[PDB]
Design brief:
- There is one protein chain.
- The chain is mostly beta strands and 373 residues long.
- It has 2 domains: 47-221, Cathepsin D, subunit A, domain 1 (Beta Barrel); 222-373, Acid Proteases (Cathepsin D, subunit A, domain 1, Beta Barrel), CATH 2.40.70.
- It has helices at residues 11-18, 21-35, 160-163, 185-191, 270-280, 349-354, and strands spanning 2-9, 60-63, 67-68, 73-74, 77-80, 86-89, 113-123, 126-139, 142-153, 168-171, 199-203, 211-216, 224-232, 240-247, 250-259, 266-268, 283-284, 291-294, 303-306, 311-314, 320-322, 330-333, 335-337, 344-347, 355-360, 365-371.
- It has a 15-stranded mixed β-sheet that branches.
- Keywords: Aspartyl protease, Disulfide bond, Hydrolase, Membrane, Protease, Signal-anchor, Transmembrane, Transmembrane helix, Vacuole.
- Belongs to the peptidase A1 family.
- It comes from Plasmodium vivax.
- It is found in: Membrane; Vacuole lumen.
């Protein structure tokens, strides 16, 4: 079973590009100290001028060995579990961002098959437009003709496009954003018997925050222990399921919970979480997408996510990290307020460091298991 190693970059890493570890630690430390004495009627959790943006919620998953065409054109791709599409920037692309990218040139590949259907597709960070083309897509030892989008306009994807070193996106979701008749490459791979099962899995090593492994086609026993329990999607087009969420005394019944290695933390509706934070004496670091308190905060509960048949937990040690100092004085809580509606949570990277996960198109479900390390 094909296993693609990918690299992960987080908002925290982004932060470190500009702030030194040193001053980031002191800024946070000196900030918390201020909170334990300063603004009495404090317990700061942000403001209209200090908000958590969606870019502060996303991890980026880079995989740079996929190829398009029978001549080995290489591209840096990022995985998106929210959509079915594959797209690469086209040689015909005249946008500014395209000048620094690996461009796809169909004239150099004798498996290219023209299609031409115009399309546009929108991501949270913006829209791109191009047209359909079909050619060999190679991923490791796997290769097959696959219909993808050749992007020619990326203007509406700025400033992200020119700021992030990726060429295109490979969809691990269900929804074709062009509302064309496109199947996710995983399903198509199954459709052409390139793989045993239309499913893929995520294994996120607890010891290496910058690494992840996507296995396509089957389940590797080496990634997990005990059994895998399945949960039926509550939606036709997203890796989303029903769970009762328990954050200590805080409870939400039958919440919508999206499972997404692409998300940097656990996310929760802002009221529910701000509340959660207001009891634990957690503060938001002003101007930074971080929430912190003492690593050994006595009150930090074990999160519980329950279904009819199963229970998943997330103990404090899985959602709390020492600000950078492997030495735990202050910790960030890997939870971020995100409002998609009144009911929706995301189980992002931290939950998946503990739980190995299976995304099964055939069974229309997400499988969960204790990850082996």
């Amino acid at each position: 079973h094909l296993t693609l190693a990918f690299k992960i970059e987080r908002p925290y890493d982004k932060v470190l590009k500009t702030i030194s570890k040193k001053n980031l630690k002191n800024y946070i430390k000196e900030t918390f100290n201020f909170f334990k004495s300063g603004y009495m009627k404090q317990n700061y959790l942000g403001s209209e001028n200090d908000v958590i943006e969606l870019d502060d919620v996303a991890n980026i998953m880079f995989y740079g060995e996929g190829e398009v065409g029978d001549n080995h054109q290489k591209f840096m791709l990022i995985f998106d579990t929210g959509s079915a599409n594959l797209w690469v920037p086209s040689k015909k692309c005249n946008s500014s961002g395209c000048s620094i990218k690996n461009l796809y040139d169909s004239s150099k590949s004798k498996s290219y098959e023209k299609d031409g259907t115009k399309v546009d597709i929108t991501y949270g960070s913006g829209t791109v437009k191009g047209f359909f083309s079909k050619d060999l897509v190679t991923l490791g030892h796997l290769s097959m003709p696959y219909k993808f989008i050749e992007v020619t306009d990326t203007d509406d994807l700025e400033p992200i496009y020119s700021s992030v070193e990726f060429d295109g996106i490979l969809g691990l979701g269900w929804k074709d954003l062009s509302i064309g008749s496109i199947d996710p490459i995983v399903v198509e791979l199954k459709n052409q018997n390139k793989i045993d099962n239309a499913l893929f899995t995520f294994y996120l090593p607890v010891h290496d925050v910058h690494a992840g492994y996507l296995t396509i086609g089957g389940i590797e026993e080496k990634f997990y222990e005990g059994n895998i329990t399945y949960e039926k999607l509550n939606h036709d087009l997203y890796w989303q399921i029903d769970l009762d969420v328990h954050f200590g005394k805080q409870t939400m019944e039958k919440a919508n919970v999206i499972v997404d290695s692409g998300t940097t933390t656990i996310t929760a509706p802002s009221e529910f979480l701000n509340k959660f934070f207001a009891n634990l004496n957690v503060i938001k670091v002003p101007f930074l997408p971080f929430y912190v308190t003492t690593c050994d905060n006595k009150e930090m509960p074990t999160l519980e996510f329950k279904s009819a048949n199963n229970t998943y937990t997330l103990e404090p040690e899985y959602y709390m990290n020492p600000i950078l100092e492997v030495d735990d004085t202050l910790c960030m809580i890997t939870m971020l307020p995100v409002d998609i509606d009144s009911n929706t949570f995301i189980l992002g990277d931290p939950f998946m460091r503990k739980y190995f996960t299976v995304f099964d198109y055939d069974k229309e479900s997400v499988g969960f298991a204790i990850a082996k390390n």
